[PDB]
Amino acid sequence: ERKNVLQLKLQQRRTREELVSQGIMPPLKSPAAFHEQRRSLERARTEDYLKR
Amino acid sequence: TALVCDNGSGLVKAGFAGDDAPRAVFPSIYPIEHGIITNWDDMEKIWHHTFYNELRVAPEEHPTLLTEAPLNPKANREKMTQIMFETFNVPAMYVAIQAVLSLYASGRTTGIVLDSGDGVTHNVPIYEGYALPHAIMRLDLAGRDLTDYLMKILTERGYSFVTTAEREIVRDIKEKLCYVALDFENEMATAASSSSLEKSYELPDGQVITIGNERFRCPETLFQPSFIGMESAGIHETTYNSIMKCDIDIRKDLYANNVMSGGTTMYPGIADRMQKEITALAPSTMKIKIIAPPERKYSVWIGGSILASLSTFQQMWITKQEYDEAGPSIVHR
Amino acid sequence: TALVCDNGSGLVKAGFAGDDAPRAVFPSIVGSYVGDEAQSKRGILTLKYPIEHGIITNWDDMEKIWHHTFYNELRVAPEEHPTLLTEAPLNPKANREKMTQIMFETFNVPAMYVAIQAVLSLYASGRTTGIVLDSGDGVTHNVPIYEGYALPHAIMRLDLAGRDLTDYLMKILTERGYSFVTTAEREIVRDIKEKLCYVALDFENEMATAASSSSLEKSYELPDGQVITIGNERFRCPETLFQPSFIGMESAGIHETTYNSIMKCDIDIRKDLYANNVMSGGTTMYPGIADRMQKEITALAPSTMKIKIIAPPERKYSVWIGGSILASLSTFQQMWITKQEYDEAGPSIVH
Amino acid sequence: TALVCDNGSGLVKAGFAGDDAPRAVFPSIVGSYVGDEAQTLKYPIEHGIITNWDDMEKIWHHTFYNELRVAPEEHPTLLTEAPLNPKANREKMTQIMFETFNVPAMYVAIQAVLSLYASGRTTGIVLDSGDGVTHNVPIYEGYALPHAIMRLDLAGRDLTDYLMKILTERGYSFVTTAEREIVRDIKEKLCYVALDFENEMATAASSSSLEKSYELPDGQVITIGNERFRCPETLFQPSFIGMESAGIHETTYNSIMKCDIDIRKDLYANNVMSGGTTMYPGIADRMQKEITALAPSTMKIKIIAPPERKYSVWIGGSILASLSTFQQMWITKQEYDEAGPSIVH
Numbered sequence A: 001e002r003k004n005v006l007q008l009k010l011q012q013r014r015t016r017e018e019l020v021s022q023g024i025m026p027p028l029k030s031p032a033a034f035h036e037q038r039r040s041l042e043r044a045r046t047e048d049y050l051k052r
Numbered sequence B: 001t002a003l004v005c006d007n008g009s010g011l012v013k014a015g016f017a018g019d020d021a022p023r024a025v026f027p028s029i030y031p032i033e034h035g036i037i038t039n040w041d042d043m044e045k046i047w048h049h050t051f052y053n054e055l056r057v058a059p060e061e062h063p064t065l066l067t068e069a070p071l072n073p074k075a076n077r078e079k080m081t082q083i084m085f086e087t088f089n090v091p092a093m094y095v096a097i098q099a100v101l102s103l104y105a106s107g108r109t110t111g112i113v114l115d116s117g118d119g120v121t122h123n124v125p126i127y128e129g130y131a132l133p134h135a136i137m138r139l140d141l142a143g144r145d146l147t148d149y150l151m152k153i154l155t156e157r158g159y160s161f162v163t164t165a166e167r168e169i170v171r172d173i174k175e176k177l178c179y180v181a182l183d184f185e186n187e188m189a190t191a192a193s194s195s196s197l198e199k200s201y202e203l204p205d206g207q208v209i210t211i212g213n214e215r216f217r218c219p220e221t222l223f224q225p226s227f228i229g230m231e232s233a234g235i236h237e238t239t240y241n242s243i244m245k246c247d248i249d250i251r252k253d254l255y256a257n258n259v260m261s262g263g264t265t266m267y268p269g270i271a272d273r274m275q276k277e278i279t280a281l282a283p284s285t286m287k288i289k290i291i292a293p294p295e296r297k298y299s300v301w302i303g304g305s306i307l308a309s310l311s312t313f314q315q316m317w318i319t320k321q322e323y324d325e326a327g328p329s330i331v332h333r
Numbered sequence C: 001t002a003l004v005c006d007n008g009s010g011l012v013k014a015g016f017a018g019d020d021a022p023r024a025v026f027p028s029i030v031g032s033y034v035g036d037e038a039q040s041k042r043g044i045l046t047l048k049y050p051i052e053h054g055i056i057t058n059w060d061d062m063e064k065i066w067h068h069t070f071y072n073e074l075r076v077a078p079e080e081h082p083t084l085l086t087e088a089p090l091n092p093k094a095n096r097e098k099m100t101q102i103m104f105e106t107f108n109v110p111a112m113y114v115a116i117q118a119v120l121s122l123y124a125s126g127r128t129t130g131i132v133l134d135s136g137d138g139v140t141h142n143v144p145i146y147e148g149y150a151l152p153h154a155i156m157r158l159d160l161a162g163r164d165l166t167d168y169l170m171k172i173l174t175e176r177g178y179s180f181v182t183t184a185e186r187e188i189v190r191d192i193k194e195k196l197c198y199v200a201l202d203f204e205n206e207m208a209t210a211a212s213s214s215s216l217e218k219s220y221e222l223p224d225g226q227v228i229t230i231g232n233e234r235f236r237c238p239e240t241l242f243q244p245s246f247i248g249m250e251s252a253g254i255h256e257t258t259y260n261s262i263m264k265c266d267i268d269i270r271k272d273l274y275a276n277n278v279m280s281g282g283t284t285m286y287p288g289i290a291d292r293m294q295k296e297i298t299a300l301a302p303s304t305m306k307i308k309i310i311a312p313p314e315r316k317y318s319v320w321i322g323g324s325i326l327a328s329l330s331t332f333q334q335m336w337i338t339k340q341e342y343d344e345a346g347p348s349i350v351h
Numbered sequence D: 001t002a003l004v005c006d007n008g009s010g011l012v013k014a015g016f017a018g019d020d021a022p023r024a025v026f027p028s029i030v031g032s033y034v035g036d037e038a039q040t041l042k043y044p045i046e047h048g049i050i051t052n053w054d055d056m057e058k059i060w061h062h063t064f065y066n067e068l069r070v071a072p073e074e075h076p077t078l079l080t081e082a083p084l085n086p087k088a089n090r091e092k093m094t095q096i097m098f099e100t101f102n103v104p105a106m107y108v109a110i111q112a113v114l115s116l117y118a119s120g121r122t123t124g125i126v127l128d129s130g131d132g133v134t135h136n137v138p139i140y141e142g143y144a145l146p147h148a149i150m151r152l153d154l155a156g157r158d159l160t161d162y163l164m165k166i167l168t169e170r171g172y173s174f175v176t177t178a179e180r181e182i183v184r185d186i187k188e189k190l191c192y193v194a195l196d197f198e199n200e201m202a203t204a205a206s207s208s209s210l211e212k213s214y215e216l217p218d219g220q221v222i223t224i225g226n227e228r229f230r231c232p233e234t235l236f237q238p239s240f241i242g243m244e245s246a247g248i249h250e251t252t253y254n255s256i257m258k259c260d261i262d263i264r265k266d267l268y269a270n271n272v273m274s275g276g277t278t279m280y281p282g283i284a285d286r287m288q289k290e291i292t293a294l295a296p297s298t299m300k301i302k303i304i305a306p307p308e309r310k311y312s313v314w315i316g317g318s319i320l321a322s323l324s325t326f327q328q329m330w331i332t333k334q335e336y337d338e339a340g341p342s343i344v345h
């Protein structure tokens, strides 16, 4: 029953790789949690750059 | 037939892939704290009990799916897989994230889950079956906490409740008489104006206590953690923030699919409260749907059951052969 | 706090300098009613797009959209916030003058700045040099940039983008047997596109595979329950980006235009460009596009040249983010056109 | 995939760049047997510095081959190091990595810094306090300000010892090495920092609310009271164990006050705590109270203590090593071949 619907969906679904490429998931070997913080570094560095 | 084992901080839910509800549900006694296994010996014990005492099966004859918490360390699951294969010589096994299975039980593969049990609460946004780890929100306020709070403020009313057994009694009182107010201040006012909100509970020693505003002050913590001295935000705010950390394009998909799961979501009214608050926080053109199936205290387990029965799932099992070749690590892939 | 407004052909991205993702993102349409307000009341509303191919072409409806932005979505008093707007490469000076005017006179903003989209994209990646492929809903640009300045002569406009790929999808989907022609049907198809389309590493090989099995086939549920099946269409659609002829365009593909763009730049800086391809915008979100562009540019570029295609996950919003970053830089605060400056000099001062 | 190795005085945290947690965490000891396998004991790392290169070679070997199950020649490896680590020491680290383990590439990073990174910052002051050493390390746009660093040889192991002593004073014998491990357990499970020490002592005199019970392995069950907080209070009052030094609050403050005044605000608003010895309940608040009492009254004080923090250094490493943009920082085997150890600097 419910199981049948869930199955349907589960079959027609994207690979994490895809989702990353579409920007819904984080990478792709880069601490998924702690992504917030990675992105935060990234942004920092780039800032320090631009002010310099 | 496969086994399904939802290893919680307070209750173990064990059963057979297929069934609508777990065959066995028993106290997790605490080897599990805040959703994480922290005593592998006592855990081995609990598992043994599960297989041999409650389920009456030979673990080597059944593929087994275990659940785990969001943010569970890979080392953790590796230890799980090992214990499963080496200590219990299971034929095959799979580990799944609780919130996810909850979502599955509702027939969805996308949406945000509020999973709140005895020892921990999580907001876990999920897209096409995958959790967005960066958007997960842990919150160390759950069932047990609300019980403790109830002991305290009940005492403040004049009733002594402090011993462990007294704690169990209070937990009963909680489950049977507590509820979430649509509006906390209004409810407090009503509670001041009459005795309509007052209810009675009989203790085992015959004596009969009366509980009033406590009935809803209690669960109110879930929305106002400050009540127990937590600097954190409430479940509504965390849901919201979690959504707001997700790729904006999928946020609508999230808002329209709030799935609530776990014992601590069983309070009458919580659903509506969450609807009111999220509505107040979310854009005014967004559709908000809060899904709270009556079955939900067991929805995680049910999710498992369903997942495990899907023919198409049988290709996902880590087999004893696969383990033999690759070692614990193989669970991660 | 400053405002950042990326006024696109399909979506407005608005927010506050300093935030890493725009607070508000809504359709660039005015039915009067704006945005999702207009989306809901579809039956009673007639939809218009004030922005076409990256250029503002209806100043009244634009004034409307801006108003909506300030007052409805952002909930701010425009006179209390410096505001940075974006604009397209090759935007006429008269255009920006009209923008500045509307900003100062209609919204009495304290200060404002106008920046080129592609550039901001580049900035968000922490670079000030490289070539950008910016491809949104209504237009695509190759914009080479050196030390923060666009090389206008080397820019390449291409009137093939998101909306086009959606239309193409409606067509070939129909050819498969599924009717999709109405406006609403078009929105559904756009969903399908975003969720199921991708770029093949090799178009012919992919077509062959699509002929040999059903591995490439995927299913999509329509709102009316019915469930359609889409196959090779999944990758032919965005292939258009590389083979415009598919929709009857005589132009070259995004790879060829990138290349040509580079080849119009002062040869000495070309290496700097090749090693810094930045992709930005919703139409670059197809899985595989990055790799495809790497393969093709490699095939076109000298064999001793290093090719790097940068496609940050954040990219659908990288223009906006670039804005945010730029606007937060202390050192930038001296670039704002102030209301005083406007009062003395008039619109022209923006240039 | 790259390796990340946080080589501590008490625990090795090893894993793969790309993960949220370290895959392996084991005692930094050699008994020959390494790590948990080995449980006569030797600690190759003292006060954050490698002081026995042979046993260190051992522990590294164990890490690669036993705990991680990898071929070191197939993985770039990032190692951590302490603030104030001698040129010479990192020289030998590098040499051992390339020659003894033929790694493809390697990088060495300062622990406090990585802590900071894990919190999404590139500026702020870190209090990193592990098992054998504590540091205040101010960091401005990614660079440690070496002159403002403060070393303090008071840490986890110390607080454990102190606990053995004052526990004995209460009547319980605890002196053997094993007894020391037991006491360490008690510490982690029952100790905490008082918001204010005198008030807490008074309360501890007035009742048994602060008293807690702990079961030993031999069944016997001991009771610990004011000791629960007397122990960690050492971090703020080193005199308790006969140290003439200042407390972690005072050292944080002084550190800041040695920094270019203009950046001080940036520091005050970004105190990041990291390491096992910062895990005491209440420490954060305590540090907030004290720094507030020391700092200008117009300054904003924020003490950041992520739950993840016992592992934040390692996590910092992970994050750093995963950054595409970082891949250009690795010392390669080629680079080493041309330039020699020195190239690490």
Ligand SMILES: Nc1ncnc2c1ncn2[C@@H]1O[C@H](COP(=O)(O)OP(=O)(O)OP(=O)(O)O)[C@@H](O)[C@H]1O
Pocket (backbone or CB within 6 Å): B007, B008, B009, B010, B011, B012, B034, B035, B115, B116, B117, B118, B119, B120, B121, B142, B143, B144, B171, B174, B175, B176, B262, B263, B264, B265, B266, B267, B297
């Ligand atoms: N009807 C109810 N109303 C309120 N609370 C309830 C109700 N029923 C159960 N609970 C509470 O639910 C909590 C436990 O449920 P649950 O089984 O989901 O915990 P768990 O999943 O094992 O723990 P965890 O989710 O942290 O791993 C208990 O605290 C219990 O008191």
Ligand SMILES: Nc1ncnc2c1ncn2[C@@H]1O[C@H](COP(=O)(O)OP(=O)(O)OP(=O)(O)O)[C@@H](O)[C@H]1O
Pocket (backbone or CB within 6 Å): A022, C007, C008, C009, C010, C011, C012, C053, C054, C134, C135, C136, C137, C138, C139, C140, C161, C162, C163, C190, C193, C194, C195, C197, C281, C282, C283, C284, C285, C286, C316, C317
């Ligand atoms: N995952 C996806 N796959 C395919 N297309 C996508 C995807 N996500 C977004 N798009 C498309 O991107 C387009 C919008 O991009 P974006 O909103 O950044 O540009 P814009 O600024 O509004 O338009 P323009 O750059 O032309 O002025 C839409 O057509 C949208 O359908």
Ligand SMILES: Nc1ncnc2c1ncn2[C@@H]1O[C@H](COP(=O)(O)OP(=O)(O)OP(=O)(O)O)[C@@H](O)[C@H]1O
Pocket (backbone or CB within 6 Å): D007, D008, D009, D010, D011, D012, D047, D048, D129, D130, D131, D132, D133, D134, D155, D156, D157, D184, D187, D188, D189, D275, D276, D277, D278, D279, D280, D310
């Ligand atoms: N919850 C806790 N409360 C108090 N101390 C703790 C707690 N958990 C761990 N510790 C202590 O942390 C210390 C070790 O932690 P840590 O892993 O940070 O050491 P280390 O980093 O390897 O040493 P070092 O940083 O000095 O090089 C031990 O002394 C241990 O007892």
Ligand SMILES: C/C1=C/C(=O)O[C@@H]2C[C@@H](CC[C@H](C)/C=C\CC1)O[C@@](O)([C@@H]1CSC(=O)N1)C2
Pocket (backbone or CB within 6 Å): B010, B011, B026, B027, B028, B029, B118, B143, B144, B145, B147, B148, B167, B168, B171
């Ligand atoms: C009936 C029942 C309810 C329950 O969930 O209890 C589980 C398990 C229990 C373990 C001790 C208890 C005496 C054993 C079994 C109780 C099982 O602790 C809990 O009650 C904890 C302690 S207080 C609280 O609210 N939750 C959770």
Ligand SMILES: C/C1=C/C(=O)O[C@@H]2C[C@@H](CC[C@H](C)/C=C\CC1)O[C@@](O)([C@@H]1CSC(=O)N1)C2
Pocket (backbone or CB within 6 Å): C010, C011, C027, C028, C029, C039, C047, C137, C162, C163, C164, C166, C186, C187, C190
């Ligand atoms: C969900 C969404 C996507 C989008 O970018 O849509 C933007 C704006 C939108 C306005 C019409 C639509 C009914 C209103 C809002 C849809 C916005 O039209 C578009 O979808 C058009 C239709 S097909 C296409 O790719 N662009 C572009």
Ligand SMILES: C/C1=C/C(=O)O[C@@H]2C[C@@H](CC[C@H](C)/C=C\CC1)O[C@@](O)([C@@H]1CSC(=O)N1)C2
Pocket (backbone or CB within 6 Å): D010, D011, D027, D028, D029, D039, D041, D131, D156, D157, D158, D160, D161, D180, D181, D184
């Ligand atoms: C549980 C645990 C904690 C720890 O960090 O231990 C690390 C390393 C360990 C090495 C010897 C010990 C007997 C072996 C394993 C204990 C590891 O000793 C320590 O506990 C030392 C000794 S007492 C103390 O506080 N730190 C530090």
Ligand SMILES: [Mg+2]
Pocket (backbone or CB within 6 Å): B007, B008, B009, B098, B117, B262, B300
């Ligand atoms: Mg649970």
Ligand SMILES: [Mg+2]
Pocket (backbone or CB within 6 Å): C008, C009, C117, C136, C281, C319
């Ligand atoms: Mg755009």
Ligand SMILES: [Mg+2]
Pocket (backbone or CB within 6 Å): D006, D007, D008, D009, D111, D130, D275, D313
């Ligand atoms: Mg350390």
